[PDB]
Structure 1
Amino acid sequence: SYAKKPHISALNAPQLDQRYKNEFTIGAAVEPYQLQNEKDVQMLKRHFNSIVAENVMKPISIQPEEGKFNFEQADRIVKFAKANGMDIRFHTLVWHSQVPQWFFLDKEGKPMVNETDPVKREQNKQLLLKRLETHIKTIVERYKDDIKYWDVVNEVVGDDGKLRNSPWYQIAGIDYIKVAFQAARKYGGDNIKLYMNDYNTEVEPKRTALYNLVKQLKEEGVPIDGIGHQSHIQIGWPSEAEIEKTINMFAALGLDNQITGLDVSMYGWPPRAYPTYDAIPKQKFLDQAARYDRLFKLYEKLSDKISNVTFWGIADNHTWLDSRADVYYDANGNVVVDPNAPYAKVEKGKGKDAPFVFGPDYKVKPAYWAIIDHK
Structure 2
Amino acid sequence: KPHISALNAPQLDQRYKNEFTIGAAVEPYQLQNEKDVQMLKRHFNSIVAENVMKPISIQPEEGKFNFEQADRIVKFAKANGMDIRFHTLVWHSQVPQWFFLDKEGKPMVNETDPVKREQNKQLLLKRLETHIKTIVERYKDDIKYWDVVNEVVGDDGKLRNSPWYQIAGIDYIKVAFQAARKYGGDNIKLYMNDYNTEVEPKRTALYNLVKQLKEEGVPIDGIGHQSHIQIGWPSEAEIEKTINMFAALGLDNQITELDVSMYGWPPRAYPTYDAIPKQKFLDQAARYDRLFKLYEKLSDKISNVTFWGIADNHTWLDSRADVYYDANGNVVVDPNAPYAKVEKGKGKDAPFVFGPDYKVKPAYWAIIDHK
**Structure 2 unaligned runs (5+)?**
none
Corresponding residue to 2:339 among 328, 337, 343:
343
Q: Deviations over 1:216-255 (max 9, x none)?
A: 0000000000000000000000000000000000000000
Q: Deviations over 1:123-173 (max 9, x none)?
A: 000000000000000000000000000000000000000000000000000
Q: CA RMSD in A?
A: 0.2
Q: Deviations over 1:29-53 (max 9, x none)?
A: 0000000000000000000000000
Corresponding residue to 1:297 among 281, 293, 311:
293
Question: Aligned-pair distance for 1:288?
Answer: 0.1
Number of residues paired by the alignment?
371
TM-score normalised by the chain length of structure 1: 0.99
Residue in structure 2 matched with residue 168 of structure 1 by the alignment: 164
1:77 paired with 2:70, answer: no
Q: Deviations over 1:265-321 (max 9, x none)?
A: 000000000000000000000000000000000000000000000000000000000
d(CA) in 1 for partners of 2:229, 2:366 = 17
**DSSP-derived class of the 1:93 partner:** coil
d(CA) in 1 for partners of 2:127, 2:343 = 40
d(CA) in 2 for partners of 1:340, 1:244 = 31
Corresponding residue to 1:21 among 6, 17, 20:
17
Corresponding residue to 1:213 among 205, 209, 222:
209
Question: Aligned-pair distance for 1:62?
Answer: 0.2
**DSSP-derived class of the 2:116 partner:** helix
Q: Deviations over 1:300-346 (max 9, x none)?
A: 00000000000000000000000000000000100000010010010
d(CA) in 2 for partners of 1:99, 1:34 = 25
d(CA) in 2 for partners of 1:183, 1:98 = 22
d(CA) in 2 for partners of 1:142, 1:262 = 28
Corresponding residue to 1:144 among 119, 140, 143:
140
Alignment of 1:45-60 (within 5 A): 45-60=41-56
d(CA) in 1 for partners of 2:248, 2:94 = 33
Question: Once the two structures are aligned, what percentage of the paired residues are identical?
Answer: 100
TM-score normalised by the chain length of structure 2: 1.00
1:225 paired with 2:221, answer: yes
**DSSP-derived class of the 1:278 partner:** helix
Q: Deviations over 1:13-65 (max 9, x none)?
A: 00000000000000000000000000000000000000000000000000000
d(CA) in 2 for partners of 1:327, 1:41 = 32
d(CA) in 1 for partners of 2:175, 2:20 = 30
**DSSP-derived class of the 2:218 partner:** coil
Detail structure 1 runs of 4+ shifted over 6 Å in the superposition: none
d(CA) in 1 for partners of 2:129, 2:33 = 36
d(CA) in 2 for partners of 1:187, 1:267 = 42
d(CA) in 2 for partners of 1:65, 1:339 = 43
**DSSP-derived class of the 2:84 partner:** strand
**DSSP-derived class of the 2:92 partner:** coil
**DSSP-derived class of the 1:200 partner:** coil
Question: Aligned-pair distance for 1:215?
Answer: 0.1
Residue in structure 2 matched with residue 280 of structure 1 by the alignment: 276
**DSSP-derived class of the 1:177 partner:** helix
d(CA) in 2 for partners of 1:182, 1:129 = 11
d(CA) in 1 for partners of 2:166, 2:117 = 10
Question: Aligned-pair distance for 1:194?
Answer: 0.1
**DSSP-derived class of the 1:109 partner:** coil
d(CA) in 2 for partners of 1:270, 1:216 = 34
Residue in structure 2 matched with residue 236 of structure 1 by the alignment: 232
Residue in structure 2 matched with residue 129 of structure 1 by the alignment: 125
Question: Aligned-pair distance for 1:99?
Answer: 1.8
1:324 paired with 2:320, answer: yes
Question: Aligned-pair distance for 1:98?
Answer: 2.5
Alignment of 1:152-191 (within 5 A): 152-191=148-187
Higher mean displacement: 176-185 or 91-100: 91-100
Question: Aligned-pair distance for 1:370?
Answer: 0.2
**DSSP-derived class of the 1:317 partner:** coil
**Structure 1 unaligned runs (5+)?**
none
Q: Deviations over 1:149-203 (max 9, x none)?
A: 0000000000000000000000000000000000000000000000000000000
d(CA) in 1 for partners of 2:97, 2:341 = 34
Q: Deviations over 1:67-95 (max 9, x none)?
A: 00000000000000000000000000000
d(CA) in 2 for partners of 1:261, 1:331 = 37
**DSSP-derived class of the 1:163 partner:** coil
